[PDB]
């Protein structure tokens, strides 16, 4: 239950990281090679929230993959409420131990999840599953400037060491063999209105239900710390969307 308790929390939240419906569609506005015969993959799909948004604005089949059964379960449940389970199926797997036929995907999606496998690594390894001239759309943590207060910098150095500046993320994408077709930083309501805000609302009902659990206490204490650091340093970092096209 140590792991499930955390998954259980996010099932009562909008998303697990910065993002919003408008941003997912804006990122999508840059993919122009989709058709009924397209094969799309959402890696680290989570509860599939942004997956349903795609499946409603683009033709083709979508396969969500995520490490936690609990998320994949809700993912399919929701997929069924929208009568989409026919072209949108959830599956439990790992971003590194994938089994996609080489050069079979037209689009690889992944919002706030590539940090698990690593930015550069994802680029390198995921490129193999994309058809030549395919699209990889990911949102990642970025530095807005080359200089940051010690506090916010050390914080990221303790969580995600690969957080870099946009120039460097873009450089890597090209080095990996893609063309940086579209890159943009997420707006702030992607952190407040659609993430931290709805998160807080749940923190209350949730904490009482599992009163005493140190796991849930640690979590809530982290959330507030994160939301706090963002209001105090939101001018030094954020989330950016990278739409990369396979080259060669
Ligand atoms: C499960 C604990 C860990 C693997 C994930 C925590 C985490 C790390 C980096 C960025 C994220 O937004 C995020 O929620």
TrEMBL record:
GO MF assignments: methyltransferase activity
An example Gene Ontology biological process: methylation
Stretches assigned to coiled coil: none
Binding site for S-adenosyl-L-methionine: 15-16, 66, 94-95, 116
Keyword DNA damage: no
Family annotation (Gene3D superfamilies): Vaccinia Virus protein VP39
CDD domains referenced in this protein's UniProt entry, alphabetically: AdoMet_MTases (cd02440)
One Pfam family matching this protein: Methyltransf_25
SUPFAM superfamilies with a match to the protein in the record: S-adenosyl-L-methionine-dependent methyltransferases
Amino-acid positions noted as binding S-adenosyl-L-homocysteine in the UniProt annotation, renumbered to this chain: 15-16, 66, 94-95
Keywords from the named record: Methyltransferase, S-adenosyl-L-methionine, Transferase
Domain Methyltransferase per the UniProt entry, residue ranges: 40-134
Entry annotated with the keyword Methyltransferase: yes
Name of the protein this chain belongs to: Methyltransferase domain-containing protein
UniProt lineage: Bacteria, Pseudomonadati, Bacteroidota, Bacteroidia, Bacteroidales
């Amino acid at each position: 239950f140590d792991v499930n308790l955390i998954c259980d929390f996010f099932l009562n939240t909008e998303r697990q990281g910065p993002g919003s419906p408008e941003v997912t569609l804006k990122a999508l506005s840059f993919i122009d090679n989709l058709t009924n015969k397209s094969l799309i993959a959402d890696l680290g799909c989570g509860t599939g929230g942004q997956t349903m948004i795609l499946a409603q604005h683009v033709p083709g089949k979508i396969t969500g993959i995520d490490f936690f059964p609990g998320f994949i379960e809700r993912f399919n449940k929701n997929a069924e409420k929208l009568n989409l389970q026919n072209r949108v199926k959830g599956i439990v797997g790992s971003m590194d131990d994938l089994s996609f036929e080489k050069d079979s995907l037209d689009l690889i999606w992944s919002e706030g999840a590539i940090y698990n496998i690593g930015f550069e690594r994802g680029l390198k390894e995921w490129r193999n599953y994309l058809k030549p001239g395919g699209y990889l759309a990911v949102s990642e943590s970025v530095w807005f400037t080359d200089q940051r207060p010690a506090e916010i910098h050390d914080f990221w150095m303790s969580a995600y060491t690969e957080i870099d500046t946009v120039p460097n993320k873009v450089a890597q994408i090209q080095k990996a063999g893609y063309i940086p077709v579209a890159t943009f930083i997420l707006p702030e309501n992607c952190w407040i209105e659609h993430y931290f805000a709805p998160q807080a609302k749940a923190e209350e009902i949730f904490r009482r239900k599992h009163a005493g659990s140190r796991i849930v206490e640690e979590l809530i204490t982290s959330n507030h710390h994160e939301a706090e650091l963002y209001s105090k340093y939101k001018a030094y970092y954020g989330y950016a969307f990278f739409i990369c096209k396979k080259g060669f």
